[model samples]
Target: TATTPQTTDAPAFPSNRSCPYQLPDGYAQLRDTPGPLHRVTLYDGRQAWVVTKHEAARKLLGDPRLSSNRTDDNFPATSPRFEAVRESPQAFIGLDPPEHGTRRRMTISEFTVKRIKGMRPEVEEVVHGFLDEMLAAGPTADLVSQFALPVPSMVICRLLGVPYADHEFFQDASKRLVQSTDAQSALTARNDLAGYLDGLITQFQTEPGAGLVGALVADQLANGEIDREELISTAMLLLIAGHETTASMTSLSVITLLDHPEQYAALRADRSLVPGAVEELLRYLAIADIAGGRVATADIEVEGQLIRAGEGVIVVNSIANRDGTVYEDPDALDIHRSARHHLAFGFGVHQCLGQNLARLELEVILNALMDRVPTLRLAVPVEQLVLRPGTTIQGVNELPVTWHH
Candidate 1:
């Protein structure tokens, strides 16, 4: 018998979602990976089990046995960016239940779907104001920055009670925290953030934790309860987690609709579909690639695999959103899709806090575009545009668009 050469390959976790319209490569590769749950390599030379199926992901993410505590050696952070800040508490994203559940609930009243519904008129006004300004600026303009970015940037600002004067700093620093390419850039911001607190004597609330950089300057700075570093981290988390997601989703949703012209036309014809379209788009994009990471606190079994305690499990919502069993045609975009149950927001205690607000904002702008600019279309090819690279939230840097009357 003749000797034969052998080939070997292993799935890599924490992968990139290259296009605004597709899931990451490793996600598609899971189809051939032999099981619903399998151990795989990480970018930082560690290994963990990645749950590939929709039901399995939901079960695992919702499992109390799995931990969100990010400092564990088993926590699957892909880079050095988060390690520097682990020393300080930023927000509830990394917390587990008891504390996580209690803290997360505090904001629920502030962001409930019912609470946000009252703001529909004000939201419509905000959308129109930006549209008017954009129309004045151009028959052609970068929708990504001029319109898409401002809508949500301002929305979160008002929701958090952030001042208008500081929007410039938040936008710049926020983008740097999530969108910057160089590894060192985030570390630099950490100090500036800590340094910002030092400037607060009478200015800062004394303790930044009790107040979310929100607790009204008079009430906050009048007392000292929160840690200096935690206050700054909260601001960074506000910008990083809160603002970035809406901005990217809005821009990417437009890009997706434009890619499917019939869908855009259908949206224009039937305005009722905007709400469903936003849901479908949320699932369709799953812009945040690393849905989230958890290290199992105890042994757990799912999909015929036993994931032992203290092991990292990375759930790619971008992949779970594409589960064939969940949607009729998981990869395709249909504006009327009933994808409300999709894991775009993850599936458990730690799911997105402002998902309702995000939904409302998406519906508002898409309607504004579809109604006001029926002729709207991209001015440049998608390939010519640059996207924010290596960030958890997926989005384009510039979406140059134009329309004809």
Candidate 2:
């Protein structure tokens, strides 16, 4: 007779509470739950097996038997209309090998170390400009609106060869898209953004602005390898992912630092501490938690948990980042804590493509702000801060802060 799956006696995963934006006090209790697969349902009502163990998450992410392309019949059902948008060809995250590889390669050069190094001066300049504006606004400012959001927006717009003057349009659209309360509005914003990208791609074909779009077009003309649809899709992916994720990180980092003044002071006293601090913040925050939703291409055993063929698996990045097996003090935010193994940018074949750019942006912004405003504090009670709910990305909608001269 076949052996039955050996199970632990840990309590069943809690179903009484909803996943809130902020880290709850009981998070530790839930994190300590012993299992490879914690039973839970996603926001979209799909049955999900949440992978919390660090080793399990890493193995699941890299396993070839698991496929990211899941819009087919075997895929689990999702609720939000934007589910289709996420799975669209315009976004590369939903694609598997060959297509994903080709699309990623097309833009790899633009984000390479050499190219990113060249863009550092420009990024620093942008950071300084935003800082100056915020300082001028007053000793108190909402960094999220004035500094955090705009810096990444400007950088991404420049890279995509799109006009930055329409940032408000994009910003409003992004807010609508990510905020779950406004599903209809989010869908409308998504369509509008897509239409805008379509027009921008056509314009680039003719005028060819001096950015990634121009370079991609020139390469396509020379090689005749990639088509216009592929070009537009890739551009859309960069614009949306590039800005939204980075902006969320930037905003959340500031909030986290301000909340923990002691930790903030430690980093402020030592300029060399920025790099490690960035990693810690990335791991502790785990901004983009829900990712690597893959379909089981074949039978695979993940952490001794047998995920049968045709099953859907969601790799919980937040759980992996905080895995006690990997992080010594996973619950605490320690800037000096060694986080070289953290999977904040992810791991394996599908790690974040723009991680370098994100690092540069974060380092510059943190260095400039902390150096300039040593006394920055929350403008209101921390509890009053609003977090955008029902979205994949967990971030504060508005981070009101004040600084004293």
Candidate 3:
């Protein structure tokens, strides 16, 4: 396979005001002129190949030729900030198939749609509990802290058999593990979280609770398929992935609704539209900026570009979600828009295992807000919203809002 770059008169995507934010210009240019491949320089000074076409991203995600394993000595990482977290063997995000397939399968039985649906009563209770607090706090509140963050955090903790009281500690550890700019802090957070989870697993082994962790611990003890260290790391991964991503999505969805009053009204008027509306919000916002990491299994050509074996590739889910070829009026916030096919949860073997759980949480939270708080609006300007940039997961730092009785 040989490498060939597209030649066009399309203008370069303009950078945004935020240091690590993607400029609207980039999405604009990409939307107007679809391409197989585009080049952009990441904050780490490495040249990255951004795939904007939906078909290409879908193909690349499932292609066996591209390995997800990070054992390659020369794999290019976006930055040293993520090196510690990614280097861990228990970190399943960067693993290859067969091994990845085996590990993922162990928990697949617990994540089916039916199982997640059965959890709705508990999920609803958590949402209503948070709503109670928000209402008691009166008109002005940081919904992110009150509702968005806690719903998913509590749910994930409960699902993993971790105590809800430890939410603050693990949440802090998870945030630092993901957001720390320095390597040392990230490692410290990672180790601290792993240690906490290690202790939890031991407790589960002795006195089992009722969730994925407890079941896994009991089953593993019987089968001897996994050891203590593997169990702890896997639980930690679930804890982080289970909550943080959903928390950000929940918070961002609320912010998105507030930004588009008309769409929010449309959703509220027709409660039945909540599911599709949530899908549209997920696709439109595309909070998870980075999707999957891939290492070339062998020399292969992707959309007419040469990708040498041993090179690391990252698929930008945000860009792919907004590809104009797949979406009509890609940037518009349309609650009625058909968003049945979005890559926000990713595609193929590594697709988010907890998507069904995420969808339930998003739907419940959005509905609770719409049904309960009628006049909810942003307490701060959209520009003032702090967006996480330069990292794989993009989310707001704070979501301030106010509602009228």
Better of 1 and 3 by lDDT: 3
For model 1, name the residue pairs that clash.
204-221, 205-220, 205-221, 206-224, 207-224, 207-225, 207-226, 208-226, 209-226
Report the lDDT tens digits of candidate 2 across residue range 1-405.
859985633333222213222354334555688766665555555555657778888888888888877565555433354454553454456678777787778778888999889989989999999888888888677877888888988998888777898888877776666653444665677777777777776776677678787778777734777766666667766787777787888877877787788888989899899989988888887776545467787888755677878876767677677787888867778899998878878788789999989998899989988777777777887667766542356666677888886
**How many steric clashes between backbone atoms does each model show?**
9, 0, 0
Name the runs in model 2 displaced over 4 angstroms: 1-30, 74-81, 180-184, 221-224
- Deviation from native of the Cα of residue 79 in model 2, angstroms: 5.0
Off by over 4 Å in 3: 1-23, 30-34
TM-score of each: 0.89, 0.89, 0.91
Clashing residue pairs in candidate 2 (N, C-alpha, C atoms within 3 angstroms) = none
lDDT of each: 0.73, 0.73, 0.74
Model 1, 1-405: lDDT tens digits are 847864325456666656778866766887436566767777677888777778878888888999988878788776566566655674668888787765555456667667799878878998999998888886899987898888887777666556556667667767766754455787666665456444542354453433335563344234544444545555556645667788888888888888999888888888888888888998888877554688988999785688889888888677777888888788888877789788889988888887888888888888898878878888988778766544457888788899874
Best by lDDT: 3
For candidate 3, list the clashing residue pairs, or say none: none
Q: Which ten residues in a row have the lowest lDDT in candidate 3?
A: 12-21
**The 10-residue segment with the lowest total lDDT in model 2:** 12-21
* TM-score of candidate 3 to 2 decimals: 0.91
